[PDB]
Amino acid sequence: SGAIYVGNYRVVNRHLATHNDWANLVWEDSSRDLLVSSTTAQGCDTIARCDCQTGVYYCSSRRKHYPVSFSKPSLIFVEASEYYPARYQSHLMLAVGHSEPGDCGGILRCQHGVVGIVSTGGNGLVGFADVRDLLWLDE
């Protein structure tokens, strides 16, 4: 689990959105596994606006932050799960790192701010849904 809190927005994995998120919906995109809802309180996270390919992510299954190198946002095939059929997920970045089901929502960050959130995983792989192109999160 986990979210980005920037301005009056809450960014979560679409597959983990709650009823309150859907009832306060700003934007959602199943192809990216992202959903943004509105908040009453202002958040403290800032979004990175860069082309970094190195950063650090939070892994809840190890209670640890790990440095990673990650690929550029791309269209990647993701296997069928209990949340989506087998499909191509867009704006996804892959890295070598530990992940398990339940780690979705952990933040990936660089020196410029938040880059994205954990959205997929494999044997020694972790995938992140990029948010750097969502300029509207800044206003």
Ligand X SMILES: Cc1cc(C)c(CC(=O)N2CCC[C@H](C(N)=O)C2)c(=O)[nH]1
Residue positions forming the annotated binding site for Zn(2+)? 50, 52, 110, 112
Q: Which of positions 35-94 make contact with Zn ion (CB under 5 A)?
A: 48, 50, 52
Active-site residue flag, 33: yes
Instruction: Give the C-alpha separation, 38 to 62, whole Å.
Output: 30
Comparing CA positions, the residue from 43, 50, 66, 39 lying closest to residue 133 is 50
Residue 48 interacting entry, from Zn ion, ligand X, none, C-beta within 5 to 8 Å by type: Zn ion
Active-site residue flag, 15: yes
The active-site residue out of 33, 59, 103, 130 is: 33
* Least distance (Å) between residue 8 CB and ligand X: 25
Minimum CB distance to ligand X smaller for 50 or for 108: 108
Minimum CB distance to ligand X smaller for 34 or for 114: 34
Minimum CB distance to Zn ion smaller for 26 or for 56: 56
User: According to DSSP H, which parts of the chain are helical?
Assistant: 19-23
Q: What angle do CA 76, 128, 30 make, to 5 degrees?
A: 65
Active-site residue flag, 130: no
Phi first, then psi: give them for residue 116, nearest 5 degrees. Answer: 180, -165
- Note the maximum CA span of the chain: 39
Look up tokens 């892959």; give the residue: 94
* Least distance (Å) between residue 70 CB and ligand X: 15
